[PDB]
């Protein structure tokens, strides 16, 4: 019996491949070669947010593009005033091993998670005076890899149990559970319309999920190793993934295909962090080579190198207005670039 | 009004920074370890991740044992790269081969090349039985043990047949082949044999951590 299902899967795979090949009207390079390159982009460290004890695994920006939350393995979640290099808050964490941290889009709330398999939401703007934990979310059977707020009283979390989840912070329950991956889901990015979110995993696959109904509408493949970082394009019709095969590649939802390969012969280390710009023209990607590469998303070329970190770059972000780039790295230093 | 909030930010920063200095002192005082395989080791030492604290000679040790996580260790093992050492408890009685290649992967990992490994060789007590009458992996799955003799630099460990000792040092040498190849001052793979009589593994890990910290002190103090 199982042979029949295997043959059915094989013929569906062949049909999908044929449809995708038909969809390949032209490559991105052919219609892109006519645009001017962005040039040798070089931005210096405008501000170094020193103060973390251990490696910075994650960081997130606030909506106002002025405050900044950061997560490090020493167990501290420091909120920074990047304008005046001032530490607004220093939140201790129950679990030191934190791999993700999120800032609520309306402020007032910050979430973090890691190997504890728990997403913890902290209330910043409280009438008591001090930041304390509000709701402790449990239910994921694997390590938390990425958590993102979509709005208040609701959060989307990715885990190492090959599943993504939606939560209601008031009740603390799982509204919708997303399944379908066979590898460790690593990064999730929300669409600007707050209705879909992609998830790259270790099975060399990227899946687009529908938040409300909760099904995997479209799946994407093309990498030969684990996808470590993912980031929606400033418009929610494309996203870019970085993998351990020392390459970065761009996907499109409405094409179900491959767009551009950001790889170079010297580059032999994987990608840890991917973050687009406000215009999407720059695909700033973190690398294990202790530096960040500013890949022009349209023209696949190394148009910038963000050298300055002694150890591996673990996280990367861009302000909402695009006025700054935060680069956390394993050298326990957060650097702002502009 | 701007000046008032400026002083408010300055005083908040002052409080946060003094707290961060105290936390720096606490964090530097503490040493971090990761257990990879046993619950018996955790029990004798003193949720997604289990945290264990213990004290030896007034030095604070933190031990992290991974619990509710999948068998794929290929990325969450990257977190434990700043730890003092990775305690690798091998069953050693196929368990032996899988553990051998786990140790290979840890030793040759890019982020664990600077991370030292402590290797403990569990299940030594029943190793004597399994070599005396088991006729098992050491006899069959590792036929090179027959042509392998006991090295001269062998601890006595009296009260056992020479076959027991030669098999023990045989699989220890199999681990040390991976340990020595691509090996430098970055990490050493200290080999030890488990002792279930007492919990002296705490002292073994303490001495190994002392050696590791002495090595990095030789490094950073420009004494090499």
């Amino acid at each position, epitope marked *: 019996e199982l042979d029949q299902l295997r043959q059915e899967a094989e013929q569906l795979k062949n049909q999908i491949r044929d449809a995708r090949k038909a969809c390949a009207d032209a490559t991105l390079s052919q219609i892109t070669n006519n645009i001017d390159p962005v040039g040798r982009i070089q931005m210096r460290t405008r501000r170094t947010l020193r103060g973390h004890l251990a490696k910075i695994y994650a960081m997130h920006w606030g909506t106002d593009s002025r405050l900044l939350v950061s997560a490090s393995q020493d167990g501290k979640l420091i909120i920074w005033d990047s304008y005046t290099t001032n530490k607004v808050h220093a939140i201790p964490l129950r679990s030191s091993w934190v791999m993700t941290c999120a800032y609520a889009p309306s402020g007032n709330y910050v979430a973090c998670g890691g190997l504890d398999n728990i997403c913890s939401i902290y209330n910043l703007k409280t009438r008591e005076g001090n930041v304390r934990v509000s709701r402790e979310l449990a239910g994921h059977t694997g390590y938390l890899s990425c958590c993102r707020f979509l709005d208040d009283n609701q959060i989307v979390t990715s885990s190492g149990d090959t599943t993504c989840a939606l939560w209601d912070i008031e009740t603390g329950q799982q509204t919708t559970t997303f399944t379908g991956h*066979t590898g460790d889901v690593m990064s999730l990015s929300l669409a600007p319309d707050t209705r879909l979110f992609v998830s790259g995993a270790c099975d060399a696959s990227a899946k687009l999920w529908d938040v409300r109904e909760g099904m995997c509408r479209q799946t994407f493949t093309g990498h030969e190793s684990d996808i470590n970082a993912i980031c929606f394009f400033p418009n929610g019709n494309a996203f870019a993934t970085g993998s351990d095969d020392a390459t970065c590649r761009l996907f499109d939802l409405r094409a179900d295909q491959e767009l551009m390969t950001y790889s170079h012969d010297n580059i032999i280390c994987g990608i840890t962090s991917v973050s687009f710009s406000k215009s999407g023209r720059l695909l700033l990607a973190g690398y294990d080579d202790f530096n960040c590469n500013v890949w022009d998303a349209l023209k696949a070329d190394r148009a910038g190198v963000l050298a300055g970190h002694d150890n591996r770059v673990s996280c990367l972000g861009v302000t909402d207005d695009g006025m700054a780039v935060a680069t956390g790295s394993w050298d326990s230093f957060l650097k702002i670039w502009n | 009004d701007q000046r008032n909030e400026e002083k408010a930010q300055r005083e908040a920063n002052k409080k946060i920074e003094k707290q961060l200095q105290k936390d720096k002192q606490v964090y530097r005082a503490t040493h971090r370890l990761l257990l990879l395989g046993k619950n018996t080791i955790v029990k004798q030492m003193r949720s997604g991740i289990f945290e264990t604290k213990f004290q030896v000679d007034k030095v604070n040790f933190h031990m992290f044992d991974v619990g509710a996580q999948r068998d794929e260790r290929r990325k969450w093992i990257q977190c434990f790269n700043d730890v003092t050492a990775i305690i690798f408890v091998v069953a050693s009685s196929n368990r032996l081969q899988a553990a051998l290649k786990l140790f290979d992967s840890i030793w*040759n990992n890019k982020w664990l090349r600077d991370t030292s490994v402590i290797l403990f060789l569990n299940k030594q007590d029943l190793l004597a039985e399994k070599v005396l009458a088991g006729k098992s992996k050491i006899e069959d799955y590792f036929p090179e043990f027959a042509r392998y003799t006991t090295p001269e630099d062998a601890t006595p460990e009296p009260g056992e047949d020479p076959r027991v000792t030669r098999a023990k040092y045989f699989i220890r040498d199999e681990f040390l082949r991976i340990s020595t190849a691509s090996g430098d001052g970055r990490h050493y793979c200290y080999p030890h044999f488990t002792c279930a009589v007492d919990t002296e593994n705490i002292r073994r890990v303490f001495n190994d951590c002392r050696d590791i910290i002495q090595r990095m002190h030789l490094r950073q103090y420009e004494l090499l």
Partner: nanobody
Amino acid sequence: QVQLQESGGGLVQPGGSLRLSCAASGFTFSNYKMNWVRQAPGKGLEWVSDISQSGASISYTGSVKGRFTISRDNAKNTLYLQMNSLKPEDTAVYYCARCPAPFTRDCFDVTSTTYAYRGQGTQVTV
């Protein structure tokens, strides 16, 4: 789209030879330290042998040492694993799993039950 399509061996007499290759169309087949793992029925996945990225650095287990030999073929993108003199420790689904990452000598998790780049199809029923 990593694929590790297998070429089934079939029936082999005790002490015979099979020497069945595999297929690969997703990865480059030159930067991955691929090995061989098999799942005998009623046992967990067990390692067999390894081959380096380009050549040499062969590793075996005793159950296969001196009996079967590997042959990485870059041109055909095939891992041969020439095998002969079969014993009862056989009749498993053979997976020619590859390294999780390229340009490294690290195989952290290949013998797991949920590894992705494994493949299936080589039955070696004795």
